[PDB]
Amino acid sequence: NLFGEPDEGIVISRFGMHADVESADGDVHRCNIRRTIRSLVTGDRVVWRPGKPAAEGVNVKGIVEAVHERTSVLTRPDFYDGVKPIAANIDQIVIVSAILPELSL
């Protein structure tokens, strides 16, 4: 509770109970998520509020309220897990492989 400014920022990573949200200038600021969010992926622009600092300058987390629309999505299903998106909102993928241990086709 006692949230801050609703703004647009880029989510750095996903950690289940919380997420890392980069602001509009390059500030690593970890936040938790809203209960009604169906999914949150790496690199998804969101609407979020950075809580409120309890100590002056020292805050713990904020919240991520809403999720914008998807440009792309990477949905891959799995046995006994269902269809799960991995990453989203991307224009180019680079398939990276190595000759070790194997190079399959």
Added chain:
RNA sequence: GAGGGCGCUUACCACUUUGUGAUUCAUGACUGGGGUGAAGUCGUAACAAGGUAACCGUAGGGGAACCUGCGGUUGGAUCA
């Protein structure tokens, strides 16, 4: 003179010093796991004969669930 006091010395002994032990708390780089986590990734182990029957004990293997070897049990299906 007898005797006493003072003073000195000795025995006992508190505090105090060194050497070196046992025990206890606080601090403590680092490090060993374990628990609590609905949505995170990795796999599909077990529960049906759960798709190589499972499990216990022991040795080895490898991100991991686990696997194989030896022996035991039915807390196993199908049974003749």
